[PDB]
Structures are given as C-alpha cells and as structure tokens.
Amino acid sequence: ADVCMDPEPIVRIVGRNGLCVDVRDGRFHNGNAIQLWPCKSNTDANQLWTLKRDNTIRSNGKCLTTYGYSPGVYVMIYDCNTAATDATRWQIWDNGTIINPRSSLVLAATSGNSGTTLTVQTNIYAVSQGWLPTNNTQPFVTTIVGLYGLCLQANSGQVWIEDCSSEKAEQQWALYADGSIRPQQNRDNCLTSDSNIRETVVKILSCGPASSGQRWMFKNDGTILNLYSGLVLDVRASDPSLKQIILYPLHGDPNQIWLPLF
Amino acid sequence: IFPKQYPIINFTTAGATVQSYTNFIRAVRGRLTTGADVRHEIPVLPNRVGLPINQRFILVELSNHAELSVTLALDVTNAYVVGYRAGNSAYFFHPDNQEDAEAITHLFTDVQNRYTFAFGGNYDRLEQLAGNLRENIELGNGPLEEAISALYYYSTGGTQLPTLARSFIICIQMISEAARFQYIEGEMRTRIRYNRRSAPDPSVITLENSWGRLSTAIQESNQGAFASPIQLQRRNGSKFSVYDVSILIPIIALMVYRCAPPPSSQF
Ligand SMILES: *[C@@H]1O[C@H](CO)[C@@H](O[C@@H]2O[C@H](CO)[C@@H](O[C@@H]3O[C@H](CO[C@H]4O[C@H](CO)[C@@H](O)[C@H](O)[C@@H]4O)[C@@H](O)[C@H](O[C@H]4O[C@H](CO)[C@@H](O)[C@H](O)[C@@H]4O)[C@@H]3O)[C@H](O)[C@H]2NC(C)=O)[C@H](O)[C@H]1NC(C)=O
Ligand SMILES: *[C@@H]1O[C@H](CO)[C@@H](O[C@@H]2O[C@H](CO)[C@@H](O[C@@H]3O[C@H](CO[C@H]4O[C@H](CO)[C@@H](O)[C@H](O)[C@@H]4O)[C@@H](O)[C@H](O[C@H]4O[C@H](CO)[C@@H](O)[C@H](O)[C@@H]4O)[C@@H]3O)[C@H](O)[C@H]2NC(C)=O)[C@H](O)[C@H]1NC(C)=O
Ligand SMILES: OC[C@H]1O[C@@H](O[C@H]2[C@H](O)[C@@H](O)[C@H](O)O[C@@H]2CO)[C@H](O)[C@@H](O)[C@H]1O
Ligand SMILES: OC[C@H]1O[C@@H](O[C@H]2[C@H](O)[C@@H](O)[C@H](O)O[C@@H]2CO)[C@H](O)[C@@H](O)[C@H]1O
C-alpha cells in the first residue's frame, strides 16, 4: 500500500565503547560540542536525537553540524537555519556509519574516553566510527554457532570454535553499537585481526586502538564481515581442531557461515 | 487463465541430513523471491497486486523412505502454505478473501476433486483444532515423517482432525517459517543434527508472530531504523526490544511486501 511513508524517530545514538552521542553540559548555544558520554536513563534532550525526513539529526530543535569538511574538525550543535545547509546533513548506513556526503568524512570518536568531543574523519570503517540509533543502551549478548554446530569460544587471548557446553569458559559474546564483538566476561577486550591481509590473527586483544579489524558486520548471508578489508571470518581448512579462525575471502562454504543464537 | 506449470522443490525426510535440509531451504528461498527488491539487506517477496497467477505459488513435494509423498503449495507473496495434494485428492485452507479464493482454482488442476476446509491455516485456528499449542507440539525430522504420513492418510480416511491440524503446524514451521527466518532454519538443523524432538522455544514463537510486524517496521523505517520498538524473546522467555534493523539482518531471510520503495530504487 502507498510508497513507504518514512518517519522521524526520537532515538539515542550509541557508539564507541557503549557511550551515547551527547550535547555537552546540556547546552544548546550555537557552537557547543557534541561529545561521547555515558548513556542516561531518563529523558534529557541532550542525549536524544530526532532523525528528520530531510536528513538532519536534531537534539532539542538544533542540528548536529560539522565545523568544516576536513579530517579533524569537531561536531557541534547549531540552529539548523543559521547553519550551512549541507553541513547539517548526514546519512546513517546499515553498516553503522554516519556520513556527511563531502567525500567520506564520517562521524567519529577518536578516544573512547568519557567526554571526548566528536570529530569527522576519513572513512577507514573503524570501531570509533560505528554508531547505532537505538534507545537500547546495553549490547546484545548472543552465542554464535558456526561450522558443524560448534560455538565460537575465546579463552583469554585466542578465539577458536569448540562445542557448545551452554555454561562454558565462555562462549557468550557482547555485540556492541560501535561494531565490535567483545568476550562477555572481559568487555574491554575485542575480536581483533590485524586484518588488511588475512590469516590468524583473529585474536582477542584490547578494544583501545579501536581499529578497522576490530569492526565487524553480521550479514544476511550468514557471514561475519570485516568492513574495511572486505574479508569474512573463516575456520581454517574447515577443520575445528586446528583452533584458528582466520580472515579469508567469501566463497560461501559452511566454515564461513555463522548464526546469532539468542 | 493458467497454463505454464508451477515450480517444484522436493525434499525427503528419508536420509535427511543437515545439508539436504539446508539446500532444501535455499531452494525454497530462491524460488519465493526474484532478487529484485532487497531492503536493508533482507529479501522482500512479491506484491500480490502486481502478480500473474502463474507466478503465484510454488510447489514443495515432501516424501518418507517409509513410502508416502504429499505436495504443499506455498504462496510466493507470504511464503505460506495454502493447501496440498495427496494421491488423487487436493485439500486447501479456507481462503479468507475473494481474490484468493479465485486463485486457489489454479493449483492442482488434474485432481479427481479438490476439497476446501472450513477452517484457516492461521495457527490460532490450527492450535485450537489440535487441542495443543505450538509449544506442546514437537519439531524435528521424526515429527515431519509422521506429519507426511498423517497428511497422506487424510485422503484415504485415517483422517482425525486434531492430528491433521497438528501435522499442519509441524509442516508450516519447518518449511515456511524456516524459509522466512535463518534463525528458525538453524533451529530445525540443530534438531536434525542430533536427532532431537523438541517443542520450539519462546524465541521461535515470538519471531513467527512478529513476521508481518518486522516486515512493516523495516520497510517504513527511515535509514538506520524505526518508529517503535518490536519486543522479542530470548530462548529463555526474556526481555529485549529492537529499535534498529542491524540485529535483524542475520535473522530475517524474507519479508512480505508492505509499501513500494521511494521510487523503484532503494536499500
Ligand atoms: C526512545 O526513548 C525516547 C524517550 O524515552 C522516546 O521519546 C518519546 O517519543 C514519543 C513518541 O515518539 C513522543 O511523543 C509525542 O510527542 C508529540 C508532540 O506534539 C506537538 O503537539 C502539539 C499538537 O498535538 C503541537 O502544537 C506542539 O508543537 C506539540 O509539541 C505529542 O503530540 C504526543 O502526545 C500526546 O499526544 C496526544 C494527541 O496529540 C495528546 O492529545 C495527548 O496529550 C497525548 O498524551 C507524544 O508525546 C514523546 O514526546 C517522546 N518523549 C519525550 C522525549 O518526551 C522515543 O520515542 C523512543 N524511541 C523509539 C524509536 O522508541
Ligand atoms: C556500508 O553501507 C553502505 C550502504 O549504502 C555502502 O554504500 C554504498 O555502497 C553501494 C553499493 O551498495 C555503492 O554503489 C553503486 O552505487 C552507485 C549509484 O547508486 C546511487 O544512484 C542511484 C540512482 O541513480 C540511487 O537510487 C541510489 O539510491 C544511489 O544514490 C552506482 O554508481 C553503482 O552502479 C553501477 O556500478 C557499476 C558501474 O561500475 C555497474 O554495476 C553498473 O554501471 C551500475 O549501474 C552501484 O549501484 C554506493 O555508491 C555506496 N555509497 C553510497 C553513499 O551509497 C557501503 O559501501 C557499505 N560498506 C561496505 C564496506 O560494504
Ligand atoms: O557534559 C558532562 C555532563 O554534563 C551534564 O550537565 C550538567 C552540567 O555539567 C552542570 O554544569 C550543570 O550545573 O547541570 C547539568 C546537568 O546535570 C549533562 O547533563 C550530561 O549530559 C553530560 O553532558
Ligand atoms: O588455508 C585456508 C583455507 O583452506 C581451504 O581448505 C583446504 C585446506 O587448505 C587443506 O587442508 C585441504 O586442501 O582441504 C581443505 C578443504 O578445502 C579452505 O577452503 C578455506 O576456507 C580456508 O580455510
């Protein structure tokens, strides 16, 4: 029925390490800094954002605006009328990127420290550039079941696939709004590959560098993609006992198909 | 109207394995959608307004290595079972509207004679008629073998209405529901891999009752997503609410058409 009538939802935007996009000290004066801050339970306008039909993101009447079109400039709140029309404009992508269409200078957080001011940076698909519009501030804790019904399991620095003892040295994962997959018992540790090329180095290494390579997308076809390198999570040889999850290009075989079981 | 011949995917529960289950469902999925309309990465099914009756239904032939065979007619626009043929007989759920009742006329045109049930195949009706809820009816390969036999003997006369309705709930969940969601498909493959007979978890029940609701929510969403949280369940009966499409992308495989894209182009 009809062309799809699209809306304008009032949602929180959650991003690096779980922190919400925030208008500093709760003040709306033209030029105030948008920053990363702990997510709030309540309804203070400075952490709630309206995604408008015209592509502007608005906390309390004012637009999220970039200072200029250069790597490095900060993002600030600004009255939408006074502000340079396509600097108040942003697109929110299915793969977690809020871009400002003037090259691919992307909303980013370059430290995941509470209070960091948001900047726009060139798009390397990193954890500091993945955002989720959601009023759900806690990450999604899932079990990931993959080849031969075997579960993904981390045991301190490594990750491999083993059988699902539904209580075990864990194999429950927290999937964050920034695009990282973190081992549920140590949540400031990340599923990490020093990607670009390949192979096992899908390790568990701290989330702190927030690299591309620590950012991952669960796609419709069942693969877990590294957005940047373009390669998917792959069990080496289809052999569970080698205990290595490499990074490799999509062929489509079972050793690259995973499932979030909640 | 109809000449052509509808498409036929067959599965057999006889030496059923996780791969032949898996390839049965990709073959069903690839026969329901034409590839044209993907929105936020999930496939959308055809619109029933714009559809020739020859493009309308696909046929699934299921059998036992234990003898029998039955053919279920899936409707391409919502992936759901409209009826079946068993032997010389063809039985259909009771169409709930005038457009559909004309359509069903083109399904198993060779049969001796077609019979239309007094009830619908919506679970609500079927579960009242089985005297048992979907949570009390087990799923697994061994349940579908039984169901193909129950379906097959309603033509002759074993019949027995509770059991027919209980066999319908098993078929729709292991074919239509598994085609619609990669979550329910993998749930069914966990049962085949370990030879489990298991009633579905609260997770599975909620996804099924939310299929039409998630299809609207994703289609009228914005970019990112949505005007209202859809609430869902965990395997254990818990919590959560969904406000965005990204968690849904590895869990919904097909969506029913709700509205056209902003012109013929998007997502
Ligand atoms: C995530 O979390 C946030 C915060 O918890 C949720 O925020 C609430 O969002 C709801 C729905 O999106 C908001 O509700 C609506 O705001 C409307 C404002 O309207 C203007 O209306 C008059 C004319 O009617 C205009 O002249 C004037 O400019 C008003 O400001 C209200 O109209 C709605 O309510 C009341 O509507 C009816 C009919 O109008 C009234 O008669 C009744 O009085 C009724 O009570 C309604 O309030 C709500 O404001 C938001 N909370 C906040 C911030 O206050 C997000 O919705 C949620 N996100 C998601 C995606 O779930
Ligand atoms: C993360 O998520 C985003 C989601 O968008 C990805 O970004 C876009 O990636 C797409 C591929 O999905 C890029 O695609 C190409 O898009 C171009 C034009 O599409 C626009 O134009 C039409 C109408 O004219 C609009 O309806 C539509 O809405 C878009 O505005 C085309 O140039 C391409 O078409 C041609 O490609 C080749 C030619 O070399 C041939 O196949 C044909 O000639 C074909 O016509 C193709 O459609 C799109 O440009 C990306 N950018 C944006 C801003 O959308 C990210 O890529 C993804 N991240 C990762 C790592 O995957
Ligand atoms: O910037 C940090 C933090 O500030 C809160 O706002 C305070 C403000 O810092 C204080 O000077 C003023 O007296 O009252 C405000 C409300 O507590 C913001 O509310 C919070 O969102 C953060 O943004
Ligand atoms: O080397 C990673 C790559 O291996 C492919 O598989 C081969 C494997 O190399 C070898 O033991 C033998 O040739 O049989 C395996 C099965 O094909 C995998 O296909 C690929 O996914 C990667 O895992």
| Amino acid at position A82, single letter | T
Q: A243 by DSSP, 3-state: which? A: coil
First-to-last alpha carbon distance for chain A, in angstroms, is: 33
Q: Which long-range contacts (CB under 8 A, 24 or more apart) does B89-96 make?
A: B89/B113, B89/B114, B89/B115, B89/B155, B90/B114, B90/B115, B91/B115, B91/B116, B91/B117, B91/B154, B91/B155, B92/B116, B92/B117, B93/B117, B93/B119, B93/B120, B93/B121, B94/B118, B94/B119, B94/B120, B96/B120
Rounded CA-CA distance A145/A151 in Å is 4
Residue ranges and CATH numbers for the domains of chain B are: 1-179 (3.40.420.10), 180-267 (4.10.470.10)
Rounded CA-CA distance A94/A232 in Å is 17
Helix axes B211-219, B202-209, angle to 10 degrees: 60
Q: Is B185 a catalytic residue?
A: no
Look at residues A48, A43, A74 and name the one whose alpha carbon lies nearest to residue A61.
A48
- Residue numbers in B near A262 (CB within 8 A): 203, 234-235
- List the CATH code of the domain at A139-262: 2.80.10.50
Backbone angles phi and psi of A127, in degrees to 5:
-65, -35
Are A181 and A130 within 8 A, CB to CB?
no
Q: Map out the domains of chain A as residue ranges.
A: 1-138, 139-262
- Known binder of ligand: residue A163? no
Q: Do the Cβ atoms of A1 and B259 come within 8 Å? A: yes
Catalytic residue among B177, B185, B187, B208: B177
What is the A46 CA–ligand 3 centroid distance (Å)?
Answer: 9
Q: Is A232 a pocket residue for ligand 4 (Cβ < 6 Å)?
A: no
Rounded CA-CA distance B237/B262 in Å is 38
Helix axes B161-180, B141-156, angle to 10 degrees: 130
User: Residue A24 to residues A84, A116, B130, B159: CA-CA distances in angstroms?
Assistant: 21, 10, 60, 70
Are B71 and B108 within 8 A, CB to CB?
yes
Rounded CA-CA distance A46/A48 in Å is 6
- Which ligand neighbours the alpha carbon of A231 most closely? 2
Look at residues B121, B87, B90 and name the one whose alpha carbon lies nearest to residue B107.
B90
Rounded CA-CA distance A262/A166 in Å is 12
Are B1 and B51 within 8 A, CB to CB?
no
| Amino acid at position A189, single letter | N
Q: Is B91 a catalytic residue?
A: no
Resolution of the entry in angstroms? 2.5
**Overall fold of domain A1-138:** Trefoil (Acidic Fibroblast Growth Factor, subunit A) (2.80.10)
Fold agreement (A1-138, A139-262): yes
Look at residues B186, B144, B139, B193 and name the one whose alpha carbon lies nearest to residue B18.
B193
Rounded CA-CA distance B237/B234 in Å is 6
The pocket around ligand 1, CB under 6 angstroms, is made up of: A 9-11, 43, 48, 135; B 226-229, 243
Closest atom of ligand 2 to A227 CA is 60
Closest atom of ligand 1 to B241 CA is 61
Q: A174 by DSSP, 3-state: which? A: strand
Catalytic residue among B6, B21, B123, B257: B123
Rounded CA-CA distance A191/A159 in Å is 8
State chain A's maximal CA–CA distance in angstroms. Answer: 62
Closest atom of ligand 1 to A134 CA is 60
Q: What is the DSSP string of A73-136?
A: -BEEEEETTTS-GGGS--EE-TTS-EEEETTEEEEE-SS-STTPBPEEEE----GGG--EE-S-
